[PDB]
């Protein structure tokens, strides 16, 4: 049957986990920080999703790559809300 | 042509790598621990797969997200067998 | 609509980022090292891609898993060009 597509990242030792789900063209986010799953602020269009993150000290930085057709849009979390990133590709 | 879908994670100083393949609704696992590839114990249903892992000291923790329909099931490896995680996509 | 499929990895604190895109049977690579996106050296066939990476000091080691059909080919970056890895899906 048709199935959603996911991408996952984690950081630290607790850990913090973020799982992105692409469902019928919309990506949403589920979060774990040690006390139960909850819904994240990320909501962007996309059929397909990948993610990577890195720590600067204790500060997390997340990059989500959301693709519709041949266009991939990068979204960035740097502690102060999601912003559109500079990524481009000539697909 | 129709193609399988993979997810990969790695850790530590060997390094240890784990590659999950979703093929026709079934997910399986191939492992590298420095001495050749071999088949892992993970076998769970799923059309799509993502994975993340983290170390706590020397202990690996792996989380594999297996999706069928709109249901994503989280599978947990924490040193002693695969168990179903608490992940849900809604509350 | 049909959409491309991506995978992403990053390392260090700058950070460096690599984003792999599978598009109509071909996987290509875009790169960030703090100073703008550019096209990387990776070009290999595949309908689906996953990736994992690890540092050895400042030196990055990347493993890209490229799938066509039921055949997943591992590509290896160890500082000196992309080479085919030992991964096989069965014994
Ligand atoms: C309950 C059910 C529904 C509502 C279906 C389908 C199936 C189905 O039975 P199920 O027990 O899941 O057996 C299947 C299993 C185990 C796999 C692995 C299948 C399919 C089926 C067959 C084929 C299938 C179907 C699809 C879609 C969109 C895809 C992508 C799709 O390919 P994919 O998931 O790779 O391969 O259509 P749709 O979801 O409307 O209908 C057809
Ligand atoms: C040998 C072979 C088989 C057995 C096929 C197909 C093709 C095929 O020739 P190939 O040399 O691979 O040329 C193609 C290439 C290079 C690409 C990139 C293609 C397709 C083909 C055509 C289209 C195609 C086909 C599919 C399926 C399920 C998909 C998803 C699919 O899309 P996708 O992989 O994005 O695009 O059907 P199926 O596997 O039954 O049959 C049809
Ligand atoms: C412009 C356009 C083209 C050229 C299409 C399709 C659609 C389409 O309109 P759009 O505004 O994108 O509305 C859709 C939206 C928003 C979603 C979420 C859709 C589809 C469509 C419909 C269905 C669809 C279509 C496909 C393919 C290959 C897939 C995988 C596919 O599933 P998926 O992306 O999950 O679901 O065929 P193809 O790209 O040839 O044709 C059909
Ligand atoms: O604390 C939750 C949160 O702020 O964590 C960082 C990002 O995952 C956000 O989308 C998410 O809402
Ligand atoms: O601060 C945001 C940014 O500079 O972070 C590094 C890369 O993800 C860039 O594409 C992105 O615009
Ligand atoms: O040594 C192999 C193994 O035990 O490693 C941890 C997990 O990847 C398991 O599924 C796998 O069988
Ligand atoms: O020990 C298992 C568990 O608590 O680990 C952290 C998260 O992956 C949870 O969903 C999961 O149930
Ligand atoms: O400096 C760019 C580069 O060498 O970085 C390592 C790999 O990502 C290569 O494919 C890529 O061309
Ligand atoms: O050649 C490099 C290599 O040994 O690195 C470890 C694994 O990725 C192997 O499959 C691969 O062949
Ligand atoms: Zn299915
Ligand atoms: Zn194909
Ligand atoms: Zn679409």
Among C88, C32, A21, C69, which Cα is nearest to B50's? A21
Q: How far apart are alpha carbons A35 and A32 in whole angstroms?
A: 7
Helix (H, G, I), strand (E, B) or coil at C2: coil
Residue A34 is given by DSSP the state S
Residue C34 is given by DSSP the state S
Residue B91 is given by DSSP the state -
Ligand 10 centroid–CA C19 distance in Å is 27
Domains of chain A in start order, with CATH, are: 5-84 (2.40.128.190)
CB contact under 8 A, C51 and B8: yes
Asked whether the beta carbons of B28 and B43 are under 8 A apart, the reply is yes
* Partners of residue A39 in chain B, C-beta under 8 Å: 91
| Distance between first and last Cα of chain C | 37
Q: How far apart are alpha carbons C17 and B28 in whole angstroms?
A: 28
Q: How far apart are alpha carbons B83 and A82 in whole angstroms?
A: 33
Q: How far apart are alpha carbons A63 and C90 in whole angstroms?
A: 33
Report yes or no: B54 at the A interface, CB cutoff 8 Å: yes
- The two tokens of residue B20 are 């999950």
A to B CB pairs, distance under 8 Å: 64
Report yes or no: C23 at the B interface, CB cutoff 8 Å: no
The experimental technique behind this entry is X-ray
- The two tokens of residue B10 are 């790695």
Give this entry's resolution in angstroms: 1.5
């Amino acid at each position: 049957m048709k199935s959603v597509q996911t991408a996952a990242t984690s950081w630290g030792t607790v850990p913090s986990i973020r799982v992105y789900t692409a469902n019928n063209g919309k990506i949403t986010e589920r979060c774990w920080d040690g006390k139960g799953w909850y819904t994240g602020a990320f909501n962007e269009p996309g059929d397909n999703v990948s993610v990577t993150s890195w720590l600067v000290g204790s500060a997390i930085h997340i990059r989500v790559y959301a693709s519709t057709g041949t266009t991939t849009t990068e979204w960035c979390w740097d502690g102060n809300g999601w912003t559109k990133g500079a990524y481009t590709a000539t697909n």
